[PDB]
Design an enzyme around this catalytic site. Structure first.
Site, PDB file in Angstrom:
ATOM      1  N   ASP A 135       0.757  -1.248   0.000  1.00 43.86           N
ATOM      2  CA  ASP A 135       0.000   0.000   0.000  1.00 43.86           C
ATOM      3  C   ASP A 135       0.788   1.298   0.000  1.00 43.86           C
ATOM      4  O   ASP A 135       0.313   2.308  -0.508  1.00 43.86           O
ATOM      5  CB  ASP A 135      -0.975   0.024   1.171  1.00 43.86           C
ATOM      6  CG  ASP A 135      -1.894  -1.199   1.217  1.00 43.86           C
ATOM      7  OD1 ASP A 135      -2.296  -1.730   0.149  1.00 43.86           O
ATOM      8  OD2 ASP A 135      -2.235  -1.609   2.352  1.00 43.86           O
ATOM      9  N   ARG A 148      -5.845  -0.292   0.119  1.00 38.73           N
ATOM     10  CA  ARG A 148      -6.604  -0.033   1.333  1.00 38.73           C
ATOM     11  C   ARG A 148      -7.133   1.405   1.329  1.00 38.73           C
ATOM     12  O   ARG A 148      -8.057   1.734   0.587  1.00 38.73           O
ATOM     13  CB  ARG A 148      -5.711  -0.270   2.538  1.00 38.73           C
ATOM     14  CG  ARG A 148      -6.432  -0.225   3.866  1.00 38.73           C
ATOM     15  CD  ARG A 148      -5.479  -0.478   4.992  1.00 38.73           C
ATOM     16  NE  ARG A 148      -4.899  -1.805   4.863  1.00 38.73           N
ATOM     17  CZ  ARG A 148      -5.492  -2.904   5.312  1.00 38.73           C
ATOM     18  NH1 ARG A 148      -6.667  -2.796   5.920  1.00 38.73           N
ATOM     19  NH2 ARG A 148      -4.935  -4.102   5.138  1.00 38.73           N
ATOM     20  N   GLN A 163      -2.039  -8.583  -7.048  1.00 36.82           N
ATOM     21  CA  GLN A 163      -1.256  -7.432  -6.616  1.00 36.82           C
ATOM     22  C   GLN A 163      -0.380  -7.759  -5.415  1.00 36.82           C
ATOM     23  O   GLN A 163       0.573  -7.038  -5.110  1.00 36.82           O
ATOM     24  CB  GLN A 163      -2.177  -6.259  -6.265  1.00 36.82           C
ATOM     25  CG  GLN A 163      -3.052  -5.776  -7.409  1.00 36.82           C
ATOM     26  CD  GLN A 163      -4.096  -4.780  -6.949  1.00 36.82           C
ATOM     27  OE1 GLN A 163      -3.806  -3.607  -6.699  1.00 36.82           O
ATOM     28  NE2 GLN A 163      -5.319  -5.252  -6.821  1.00 36.82           N
ATOM     29  N   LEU A 167      20.632   2.409 -19.716  1.00 36.86           N
ATOM     30  CA  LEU A 167      20.560   1.393 -18.699  1.00 36.86           C
ATOM     31  C   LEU A 167      21.850   1.328 -17.928  1.00 36.86           C
ATOM     32  O   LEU A 167      21.892   0.745 -16.854  1.00 36.86           O
ATOM     33  CB  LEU A 167      20.248   0.043 -19.330  1.00 36.86           C
ATOM     34  CG  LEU A 167      21.208  -0.471 -20.378  1.00 36.86           C
ATOM     35  CD1 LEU A 167      22.394  -1.089 -19.684  1.00 36.86           C
ATOM     36  CD2 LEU A 167      20.492  -1.496 -21.258  1.00 36.86           C
ATOM     37  N   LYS A 194      29.894 -22.207 -17.014  1.00 38.65           N
ATOM     38  CA  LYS A 194      29.489 -21.904 -18.396  1.00 38.65           C
ATOM     39  C   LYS A 194      29.270 -20.400 -18.576  1.00 38.65           C
ATOM     40  O   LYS A 194      29.037 -19.655 -17.634  1.00 38.65           O
ATOM     41  CB  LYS A 194      28.193 -22.643 -18.799  1.00 38.65           C
ATOM     42  CG  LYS A 194      28.254 -24.152 -18.779  1.00 38.65           C
ATOM     43  CD  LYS A 194      29.469 -24.653 -19.541  1.00 38.65           C
ATOM     44  CE  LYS A 194      29.464 -26.176 -19.769  1.00 38.65           C
ATOM     45  NZ  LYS A 194      28.573 -26.577 -20.914  1.00 38.65           N
ATOM     46  N   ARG A 230      33.623   7.862 -21.289  1.00 39.72           N
ATOM     47  CA  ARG A 230      32.195   8.033 -21.205  1.00 39.72           C
ATOM     48  C   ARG A 230      31.546   7.795 -19.846  1.00 39.72           C
ATOM     49  O   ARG A 230      30.601   7.027 -19.748  1.00 39.72           O
ATOM     50  CB  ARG A 230      31.508   7.156 -22.252  1.00 39.72           C
ATOM     51  CG  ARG A 230      31.929   7.423 -23.700  1.00 39.72           C
ATOM     52  CD  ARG A 230      30.813   7.025 -24.663  1.00 39.72           C
ATOM     53  NE  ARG A 230      30.215   5.781 -24.218  1.00 39.72           N
ATOM     54  CZ  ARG A 230      28.909   5.528 -24.207  1.00 39.72           C
ATOM     55  NH1 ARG A 230      28.045   6.428 -24.647  1.00 39.72           N
ATOM     56  NH2 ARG A 230      28.471   4.353 -23.766  1.00 39.72           N
TER      57      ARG A 230
HETATM   58  O1  LIG Z   1      24.266 -26.785 -20.362  1.00 37.74           O
HETATM   59  P1  LIG Z   1      24.981 -27.420 -21.659  1.00 37.74           P
HETATM   60  O2  LIG Z   1      25.349 -28.941 -21.271  1.00 37.74           O
HETATM   61  O3  LIG Z   1      26.169 -26.660 -22.111  1.00 37.74           O
HETATM   62  O4  LIG Z   1      23.866 -27.523 -22.817  1.00 37.74           O
HETATM   63  C1  LIG Z   1      23.477 -26.359 -23.552  1.00 37.74           C
HETATM   64  C2  LIG Z   1      22.322 -26.678 -24.503  1.00 37.74           C
HETATM   65  O5  LIG Z   1      22.649 -27.678 -25.484  1.00 37.74           O
HETATM   66  C3  LIG Z   1      21.451 -28.408 -25.794  1.00 37.74           C
HETATM   67  C4  LIG Z   1      21.191 -28.317 -27.299  1.00 37.74           C
HETATM   68  O6  LIG Z   1      21.106 -26.941 -27.679  1.00 37.74           O
HETATM   69  O7  LIG Z   1      21.634 -29.766 -25.369  1.00 37.74           O
HETATM   70  P2  LIG Z   1      20.806 -31.017 -25.964  1.00 37.74           P
HETATM   71  O8  LIG Z   1      21.093 -31.071 -27.549  1.00 37.74           O
HETATM   72  O9  LIG Z   1      21.132 -32.296 -25.294  1.00 37.74           O
HETATM   73  O10 LIG Z   1      19.243 -30.666 -25.801  1.00 37.74           O
HETATM   74  C5  LIG Z   1      20.329 -27.741 -24.993  1.00 37.74           C
HETATM   75  O11 LIG Z   1      19.367 -28.714 -24.575  1.00 37.74           O
HETATM   76  C6  LIG Z   1      21.111 -27.257 -23.775  1.00 37.74           C
HETATM   77  O12 LIG Z   1      20.377 -26.231 -23.097  1.00 37.74           O
HETATM   78  O1  LIG Z   2      23.804  -1.906 -29.683  1.00 36.66           O
HETATM   79  P1  LIG Z   2      24.722  -0.684 -29.187  1.00 36.66           P
HETATM   80  O2  LIG Z   2      24.024   0.666 -29.719  1.00 36.66           O
HETATM   81  O3  LIG Z   2      26.128  -0.821 -29.627  1.00 36.66           O
HETATM   82  O4  LIG Z   2      24.581  -0.599 -27.587  1.00 36.66           O
HETATM   83  C1  LIG Z   2      24.581  -1.782 -26.785  1.00 36.66           C
HETATM   84  C2  LIG Z   2      24.590  -1.406 -25.303  1.00 36.66           C
HETATM   85  O5  LIG Z   2      25.651  -0.486 -25.003  1.00 36.66           O
HETATM   86  C3  LIG Z   2      25.260   0.280 -23.855  1.00 36.66           C
HETATM   87  C4  LIG Z   2      26.176  -0.081 -22.684  1.00 36.66           C
HETATM   88  O6  LIG Z   2      26.113  -1.490 -22.443  1.00 36.66           O
HETATM   89  O7  LIG Z   2      25.359   1.662 -24.222  1.00 36.66           O
HETATM   90  P2  LIG Z   2      25.738   2.856 -23.204  1.00 36.66           P
HETATM   91  O8  LIG Z   2      27.219   2.581 -22.636  1.00 36.66           O
HETATM   92  O9  LIG Z   2      25.626   4.196 -23.821  1.00 36.66           O
HETATM   93  O10 LIG Z   2      24.740   2.704 -21.951  1.00 36.66           O
HETATM   94  C5  LIG Z   2      23.817  -0.113 -23.526  1.00 36.66           C
HETATM   95  O11 LIG Z   2      23.050   1.047 -23.193  1.00 36.66           O
HETATM   96  C6  LIG Z   2      23.324  -0.682 -24.855  1.00 36.66           C
HETATM   97  O12 LIG Z   2      22.298  -1.638 -24.581  1.00 36.66           O
HETATM   98  O1  LIG Z   3      -6.024 -10.134   1.748  1.00 34.41           O
HETATM   99  P1  LIG Z   3      -6.881  -9.457   2.723  1.00 34.41           P
HETATM  100  O2  LIG Z   3      -6.790 -10.225   4.114  1.00 34.41           O
HETATM  101  O3  LIG Z   3      -8.390  -9.475   2.186  1.00 34.41           O
HETATM  102  O4  LIG Z   3      -6.377  -7.949   2.925  1.00 34.41           O
HETATM  103  C1  LIG Z   3      -6.484  -7.224   1.690  1.00 34.41           C
HETATM  104  C2  LIG Z   3      -5.965  -5.798   1.950  1.00 34.41           C
HETATM  105  O5  LIG Z   3      -4.575  -5.912   2.225  1.00 34.41           O
HETATM  106  C3  LIG Z   3      -3.842  -4.899   1.573  1.00 34.41           C
HETATM  107  O6  LIG Z   3      -3.001  -5.514   0.609  1.00 34.41           O
HETATM  108  C4  LIG Z   3      -3.041  -4.123   2.618  1.00 34.41           C
HETATM  109  O7  LIG Z   3      -2.167  -5.008   3.319  1.00 34.41           O
HETATM  110  C5  LIG Z   3      -4.793  -3.994   0.827  1.00 34.41           C
HETATM  111  O8  LIG Z   3      -4.223  -3.569  -0.413  1.00 34.41           O
HETATM  112  C6  LIG Z   3      -6.034  -4.894   0.675  1.00 34.41           C
HETATM  113  O9  LIG Z   3      -7.236  -4.126   0.564  1.00 34.41           O
END
Ligand SMILES: O=P(O)(O)OC[C@H]1O[C@@](CO)(OP(=O)(O)O)[C@@H](O)[C@@H]1O
Ligand SMILES: O=P(O)(O)OC[C@H]1O[C@@](CO)(OP(=O)(O)O)[C@@H](O)[C@@H]1O
Ligand SMILES: O=P(O)(O)OC[C@H]1O[C@](O)(CO)[C@@H](O)[C@@H]1O
Ligand SMILES: O=P(O)(O)OC[C@H]1O[C@@](CO)(OP(=O)(O)O)[C@@H](O)[C@@H]1O
Ligand SMILES: O=P(O)(O)OC[C@H]1O[C@](O)(CO)[C@@H](O)[C@@H]1O
Lengths: 750, 763, 109
Positions: B154, B198, B289, B523, B653, B741
């Protein structure tokens, strides 16, 4: 010259956009002209403007859009022939004589009354001014194709309606949330789910959420006795350690006497037993959200067939409704299905529920049975076999999947139901060999495993041959009567290994079956390994986001590397429900020739763009596609050719493809398959007082069966590429190659 | 003689309690106390001994930061109301050696704790005068030390800005509305979404802002009786008639009219149908919620508060008033339990006495600001009201750098706010390259931006081209041409550089002689002048969830660790918080690098972890590694080295979440915070017209480098829910490490430590 | 000279030799001319996949026509900046693959 019109009427459902996008492009591809019809029938009535000629790019991105982008309104005016004739003029005005309707059962019906009444309405227009007999000439007969867009999956005739699985997924999502809080206060929640007069949604959600009880019309509860049965069940589960109860109640829930069973009726009953009880009505959250992999897939294919069916129309062919039956797409007489579905109510009015339930989808009765034997029959009552009860072992062999726990759970509960003793062979074979750890599973141990991804007991790729003897030693020490192997190729390889070991090891003569489990779907003999659906969705959510990142920065391609080992199934399916302009699989050669045709399609495709906003493009490349051309080399080779015209980035989802939580489909399939296996073990155990006792549970076009591991280990690519010999998707691909925009780009380049 | 602290969750559960419990348990064991968990709330105290007051060990809260509700449960307290209950409680605690009690929950539960504390002396006395507790015990712990941690969705406890769980609930709400919106748009329908809270309207408000609802019904501004029907019908009608196919009316569950009588969803439904005659449905989200896993913010908040909560009871004395941990201006602080609950009881009173402005002041540090902001962007151009008399300027907005969650909200919010003022908003599509090469100026029409408030990506487009690279001239030209009084740049470090360039391009091109301002967004959170760039929370959540999934994997195989490549350029902000939110074992950042020595120890520490873990089920380990933490060792190579160094004991991995780190749909925090930054930027534009204007005369020697003119080119920053302004010149010349940067001083090295402690890592 | 002698010894083999010179193809060019390099890639030109394919076919036929003869080793000099995507190492790998058993290639640094 052929013009076609697509309209989306009735309640919207996730996937409609996917559906429309197919119809448009499949049409444009075959030289037709496609027109969208806004606000449903209403717009059809309003004519012009509310009716629009669609471009190829008019539907770009529609694979990941909620509801329907061409709206769905209700129209009174259409109810009168004036309106119908009205509309008919609008279409004839545009040279349109084919209508593709996608929507609820209702809209589908009305769409027939229209085709069967068109010529008649055509006359009126010829008369009362409007159109000359000459003009109205070629546009004499109406072509009509229906697509069922609904989350209720209440259309007897087809196994799945577009949007049903999406809504299901939505229900699970919400119930999963509720679980957290319910667990904290050890409460009971009565959750109400849509479904109109169909309990498919409730029934699925029931099984997928580890529900304590469900309420569906197709099985009206004992008109006066159900409140005790319910209390009984909940009470029993709670004594076994369950903290919270979850009861799923369908909208159309009713009892013997056709008296509606209400969420609160249910709530009251539980309150009476003394449990802190709440009621939640999910409401429309079940209608929003994008389409899950299943619906995008279903909608795209069915949309393509509707166009083809239209082009194949003939004067006498009746109105076709596109459906799905052995997981293959089929056409069926619309009028028939409307009646068969209309008749479902009929049997319910005459309290003949049995008749009713048989009218639902191919697997409906099975599911319901599964649900009971896995949740209500833990009374000691139901099949608590004499004393030919068994010790069943369970191992996970392979990389983690998302349905292992859910499946292990279904199998454990069932076992306990019959009085069998289910054993968990900790940490796969390598674990057994190193520690001989085999713990007996209890009802409460397996709690909440229904939606827990990963492997609670441990899973790894070690195979049985690592020390076939010590294994046999422990199978015996533990007096096992049967074995369930949950896993991928290593599991399949292990099952074979164990079959052979029979000569040298008497204990391996107990029945042994494998439930394929792997994101890769690379287990020979079956078309669906568990966890596949979960993967495909994780990839959807994944691509949906990076797709949006490319659209943001404008003019940019992403090379996305998908798992699946040496089996491009996932790659192909992903490429289709992604609109990927290029899908590099191991099955498809990757030489400089190909790369260039790819750079081409791209550059060309990019010459246009302009629309920007939602214009990011992507390539789907399989994990082993080419040892030389790695995802990176591919991406850089491509950049360098772009020559600043566009940018490239790589995407390697990676291990998230294993999922976090199993998708509703995997959660339900796991339960089916798990039980089917305990049964198979029982049968063989009794049938012994011959390798067919060592099989793999398989699904082939909807049909599930057991296949002897030996005949199968020659459909394999064994000590090589580890995958099943054949490929059942080469159709997806060629279609995909059209909607994706590939061939279209190929043409421009020449 | 090792003492002990114990935790219990009481009242309604809330997302993040587990994170709270987890930190308290670990922090206690870290400090050297014995950790105790009380099952099922206060009931747990009535019942006793183990099972209900169970001693916990480090590994017992493993993984908890990623689980919903309270794993230690919460029940309705019956027995504790009676004295025999409260007496038993004291006995059981004493019998467990626990004289330090930390409770997390709602205020009602908090006060119960205090009373118990005061009643303690009285209780132990009776306990003694009747045995039950030895004399040795009586002396040993004749005082009860407690501390509160408020968890609730809340957000209605007056002395704290955010209750644990609040933002998680907000996330759940916005997710449901986003679903509802899509079917609603299909049928051009209208939905009345009944939300929890609430008696507070914090959730309904933020949600409405985030989801661009047409109207919200909150209890802190009852303003109505007959007003709301007209108030709502009017703006809805204007909205629908102007294009919007949907109508979303957020209704606080506890909304009322000015006459204190309640306003129900039905009440609103009827009006929508009767008066406006549109297809309407009511949606009551209910407990979803309350469920779900805690959002990054909640995990991180509850984790820090938990740590402090232990510090507090550990230093409380018989004379110290009962403490309670809260947050003020994103700063973890202690508050007196009583005053706090007293101040909260206040709101109820103020409301009961029609003094709404008073109640509104008792909410969180920025409650009112949001309300005003909502109002503006909601009306925006639908009401000529153009708040300012022709003092309305023509302002331009643009995106520069990588996309980021909330940039579209910033744009949408800046546009619609301008419209409520009378300003004419212009969008420069595809940044500088899009301006110079295609004169990409466009007029932002309300209808064209439907939905933008909550879309990921970048509707107007963005790249990394700087002004100088696109030809300053062409820029200045079009600028002059469209006559922009002010510029609003939304983006990352390239957007920083831009500001800088345009400003030091002032004298030379008088078109830049206008106020400018930058709303940081990346980000990575590497833009100087702020503690929170837009898109950050969205990425933090994206990464956190990815990690949750990956670790589950690792736990499945047993004896396995994952090296996850993280983003953030030279900023370890993302990796750090992500790491804290998912309890990563190790985390490598650019500011520290990866020394072979550190790597070796981490590999040994990891090694033992798995040995001590045996084959157990939830012992997977994560190593978060910012890419720039090492140019030599990639996540891939890192895994290989660890796996080799491991030597069969365990392996590792790599994992490259990559671009999903940008997330999908921006988070409620990113969205609401965007419209907040956007509005204060428009405000900066108008408030800085004076200076550079009365000087923007002839490009004569009347233009120089005086703080007064330079200071119209600043970055809207934030220092803990604050909002500061700093000249691009100040930042760029003294507080920036432009070569890399990012800011010259890092503001989160402290929490890196906290993180190590919570997971048991050394140097 | 030494590397080519190697290649001639194995028969049906080419070497991709990483060359210096930053963005200047001067060294690769004259070296190439001086040792009779079959192919040479420079920064100023780059390595387009199309060119790469033809060079591989041409090379391919060269060895076929050459049969098993004794002094037919081939050299491909490649200035490093001739491609940031394809290293002398990756280039050999690609050629060897595209070669498809007809002949192979190794890297030289
Ligand atoms: O965790 P590892 O053993 O590296 O496996 C990676 C991936 O290779 C795969 C194939 O992409 O194995 P598998 O062919 O036995 O299914 C995926 O299942 C698995 O997530
Ligand atoms: O695909 P590009 O534009 O190269 O950016 C990839 C990532 O580089 C980042 C940093 O990981 O840019 P930036 O440093 O400006 O924040 C992310 O914001 C973005 O997701
Ligand atoms: O789940 P109960 O016991 O009905 O209580 C619900 C009340 O609890 C609250 O989540 C507050 O804790 C309110 O958002 C809601 O009205
Ligand atoms: O040891 P470093 O600094 O990497 O230099 C290596 C080579 O770089 C070169 C280019 O190959 O520098 P430069 O481009 O300036 O000619 C050579 O001169 C030098 O042999
Ligand atoms: O949204 P409406 O107009 O209330 O229609 C709701 C009905 O539509 C359906 O989604 C079927 O299309 C049912 O599940 C539901 O009961």
């Amino acid at each position: 010259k052929k013009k076609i019109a697509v309209m989306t009427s009735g309640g919207d459902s996730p996937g409609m956009n996917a559906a429309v996008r197919a119809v448009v492009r499949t049409g444009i591809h075959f030289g037709c002209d496609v027109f969208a019809v806004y606000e449903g029938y209403e717009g059809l009535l309003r004519g012009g403007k509310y009716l629009k000629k669609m471009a190829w790019e008019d539907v770009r991105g529609w694979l990941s859009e909620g509801g329907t982008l061409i709206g769905t309104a209700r129209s009174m005016e259409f109810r009168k022939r004036e309106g119908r004739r009205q509309a008919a003029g609008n279409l004839i005005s545009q040279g349109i004589d084919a209508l593709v309707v996608c929507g609820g059962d209702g809209s589908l019906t009305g769409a027939d009354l229209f085709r069967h009444e068109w010529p008649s309405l055509v006359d009126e227009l010829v008369a009362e001014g409007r159109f000359t007999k000459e003009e109205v000439a070629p546009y004499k007969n109406l072509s009509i194709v229906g697509l069922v867009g609904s989350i209720d999956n209440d259309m007897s005739g087809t196994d799945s309606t577009i949007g049903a699985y999406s809504a299901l997924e939505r229900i699970c999502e919400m119930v999963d949330y509720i679980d957290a809080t319910a667990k904290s206060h050890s409460r009971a929640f009565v959750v109400e789910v849509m479904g109109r007069h169909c309990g498919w949604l409730a029934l699925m959600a029931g099984i997928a959420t580890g529900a304590d009880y469900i309420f569906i019309p197709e099985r009206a509860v004992p008109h006066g006795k159900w409140q005790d049965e319910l209390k009984e069940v909940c009470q029993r589960h709670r004594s076994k350690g369950r903290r919270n109860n979850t009861i799923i109640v369908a909208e159309g829930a009713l009892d013997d006497q056709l008296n509606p069973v209400t969420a609160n009726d249910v709530k009251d009953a539980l309150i009476e037993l003394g449990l802190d009880t709440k009621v939640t009505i999910l409401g429309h959250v079940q209608r929003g959200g994008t389409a899950v992999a299943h619906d995008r897939w279903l909608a795209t294919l069915q949309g393509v067939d509707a166009v083809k069916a239209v082009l194949e129309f003939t004067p006498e062919t009746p109105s076709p409704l596109i459906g799905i039956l052995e997981n293959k797409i089929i056409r069926m007489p619309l009028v028939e299905s409307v009646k068969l579905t209309k008749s479902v109510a009929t049997a319910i009015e005459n309290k003949d529920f049995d008749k009713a339930i048989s009218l639902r989808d191919t697997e409906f009765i099975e599911l319901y049975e599964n649900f009971l034997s896995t949740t209500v029959k833990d009374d000691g009552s139901e099949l608590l076999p004499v004393s030919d009860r068994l010790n069943i072992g369970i191992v996970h062999v392979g990389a983690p999947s998302a349905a292992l726990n859910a499946a292990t759970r279904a199998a454990t509960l069932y076992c306990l139901s019959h009085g069998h003793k289910p054993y968990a062979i900790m940490n796969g074979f390598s674990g057994l060999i190193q520690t001989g750890e085999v713990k007996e599973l209890s009802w409460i141990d397996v709690e909440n495993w229904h939606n827990l991804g990963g492997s609670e007991i441990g899973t790894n790729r070690s195979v049985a041959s690592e020390d076939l003897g010590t294994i046999a030693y422990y199978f015996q020490k533990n007096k096992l009567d049967g074995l369930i192997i949950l896993g991928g190729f290593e599991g399949f390889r292990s099952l074979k290994q164990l079959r052979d070991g029979r000569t040298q090891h008497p204990i391996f003569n107990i029945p042994m079956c494998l439930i394929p489990a792997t994101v890769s779907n690379n287990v020979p003999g079956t078309e669906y390994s568990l966890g596949v659906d979960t993967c495909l969705n994780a990839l959807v959510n994944y691509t949906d986001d990076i797709k949006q990142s490319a659209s943001a920065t404008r003019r940019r391609v992403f090379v996305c590397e998908v798992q699946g080992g040496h089996s491009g199934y996932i790659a192909s399916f992903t490429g289709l429900i992604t609109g990927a302009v290029s899908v590099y699989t191991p099955e498809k050669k990757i030489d400089l020739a190909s790369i260039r045709e790819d750079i081409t399609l791209l550059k060309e495709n990019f010459r246009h763009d302009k629309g920007e906003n939602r214009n990011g493009k992507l390539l789907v490349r399989n994990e082993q596609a080419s040892s030389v051309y790695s995802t990176q080399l591919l991406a850089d080779i491509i950049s360098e050719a772009s020559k600043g015209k566009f940018g490239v980035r790589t995407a390697i989802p990676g291990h998230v493809q294993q999922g976090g939580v199993p998708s509703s489909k995997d959660r339900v399939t796991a339960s089916r398959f798990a039980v089917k296996c305990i049964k198979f073990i029982e049968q063989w155990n009794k049938k012994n007082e011959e390798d067919d006792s060592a099989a793999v549970i398989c699904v082939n076009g909807s049909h599930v069966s057991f296949k002897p591991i030996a005949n199968l280990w020659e459909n394999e690519t064994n000590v090589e590429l580890r995958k099943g010999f054949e490929v059942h998707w080469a159709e997806y691909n060629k279609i995909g190659d059209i909607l994706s925009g590939r061939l279209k780009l190929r043409a421009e380049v020449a | 003689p090792q003492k002990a602290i114990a935790v219990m969750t009481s009242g309604g559960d809330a997302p993040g309690m587990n994170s709270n419990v987890r930190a308290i348990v670990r922090s206690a064991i870290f400090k050297g106390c014995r950790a105790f968990v009380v099952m099922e709330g206060y009931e747990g105290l009535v019942r006793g001994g183990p099972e209900y007051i169970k001693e916990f060990h480090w590994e017992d809260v493993r993984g908890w930061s990623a689980e919903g509700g309270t794993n230690i449960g919460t029940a309705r307290c019956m027995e504790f109301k009676k004295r025999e209950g409260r007496l038993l409680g004291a006995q059981h605690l004493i019998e467990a050696g626990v004289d330090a009690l930390i409770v997390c929950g709602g205020d009602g539960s908090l006060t119960g704790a205090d009373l118990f504390r005061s009643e303690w002396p009285s209780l132990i006395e009776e306990l003694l005068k009747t045995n039950r507790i030895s004399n040795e015990q009586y002396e040993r712990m004749k005082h009860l030390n407690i501390c509160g941690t408020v968890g609730s969705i809340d957000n209605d406890m007056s002395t704290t800005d955010a209750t644990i769980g609040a933002y998680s609930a907000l996330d759940r709400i916005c997710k449901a509305i986003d679903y509802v919106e899509a079917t609603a748009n299909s049928h051009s329908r209208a939905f009345v979404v009944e939300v929890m809270g609430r008696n507070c309207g914090w959730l309904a408000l933020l949600a409405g802002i985030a989801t661009s609802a047409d109207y919200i019904f909150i209890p802190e501004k009852p303003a109505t009786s007959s007003e709301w029907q007209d108030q709502m019908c009017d703006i809805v009608s204007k909205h629908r008639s102007r294009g919007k196919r949907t109508t979303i009316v957020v209704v606080a569950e506890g909304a009322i009219a000015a006459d204190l009588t309640p306003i129900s969803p039905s009440d609103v439904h009827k009006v929508l149908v009767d008066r406006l005659g549109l297809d309407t449905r009511i949606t009551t989200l209910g407990h979803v919620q309350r469920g779900g896993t805690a959002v990054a913010y909640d995990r991180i908040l509850a984790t820090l508060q938990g740590l402090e909560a232990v510090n507090a009871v550990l230093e409380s004395t018989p004379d110290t008033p009962s403490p309670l941990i809260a947050v003020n201006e994103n700063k973890i602080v202690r508050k007196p339990l009583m005053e706090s609950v007293k101040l909260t009881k206040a709101v109820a009173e103020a409301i009961q006495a029609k003094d709404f402005k008073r109640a509104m002041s008792l909410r969180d540090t920025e409650f009112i600001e949001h309300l005003n902001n909502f109002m503006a962007i909601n009306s925006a151009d639908h009401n000529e009201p153009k708040l300012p008399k022709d003092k309305r300027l023509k302002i331009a907005i643009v995106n520069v750098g990588a996309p980021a969650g909330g940039i579209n909200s910033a744009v949408y919010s800046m546009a619609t706010y301008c419209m409520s003022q009378g300003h004419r908003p212009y969008a420069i599509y595809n940044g500088w390259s899009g301006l110079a090469r295609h004169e990409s100026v466009r007029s932002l029409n309300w209808k064209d931006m439907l939905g933008w408030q909550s879309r990921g990506g970048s509707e107007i487009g963005t790249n990394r081209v700087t002004p100088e690279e696109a030809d300053l001239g062409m820029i200045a030209y079009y600028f002059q041409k469209y006559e922009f009084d002010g510029l609003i740049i939304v983006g990352g470090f390239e957007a920083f550089e831009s500001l800088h360039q345009l400003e030091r391009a002032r004298e030379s091109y008088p078109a830049f002689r206008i106020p400018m301002v930058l709303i940081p967004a990346t980000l990575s959170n590497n833009v100087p002048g702020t503690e929170y760039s837009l898109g950050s929370d969205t990425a933090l959540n994206a990464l956190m969830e990815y990690c949750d999934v990956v670790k589950q994997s690792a736990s499945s195989t047993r004896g396995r660790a994952f090296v996850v490549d993280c983003q953030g350029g030279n900023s370890g902000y993302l990796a750090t918080y992500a790491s804290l939110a998912v309890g990563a074992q190790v985390s490598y950042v650019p500011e520290e690098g990866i020394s072979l020595e550190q790597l070796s120890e981490d590999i040994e520490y990891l090694a033992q972890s798995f040995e001590k873990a045996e084959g157990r089920g939830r012992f997977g380990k994560l190593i978060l590694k910012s890419t720039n933490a090492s140019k030599a060792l990639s996540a891939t190579k890192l895994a290989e080295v660890i796996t080799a160094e491991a030597d069969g004991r365990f392996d590792a991995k790599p994992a490259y979440p990559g671009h999903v780190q940008q997330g999908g749909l921006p988070s409620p925090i990113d969205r609401t915070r965007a419209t907040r930054m956007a509005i204060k930027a428009v405000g900066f534009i108008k408030d800085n017209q004076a200076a550079i204007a009365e000087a923007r005369a002839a490009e004569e020697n009347f233009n120089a480098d005086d703080k007064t003119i330079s200071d119209t080119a600043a970055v809207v920053g934030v220092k803990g829910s604050h909002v500061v302004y700093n000249s691009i010149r100040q930042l760029y010349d003294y507080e920036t490490e432009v070569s890399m940067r990012m800011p010259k001083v890092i503001h989160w090295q402290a929490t890196r430590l906290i993180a190590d402690h919570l997971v048991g890592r050394k140097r």
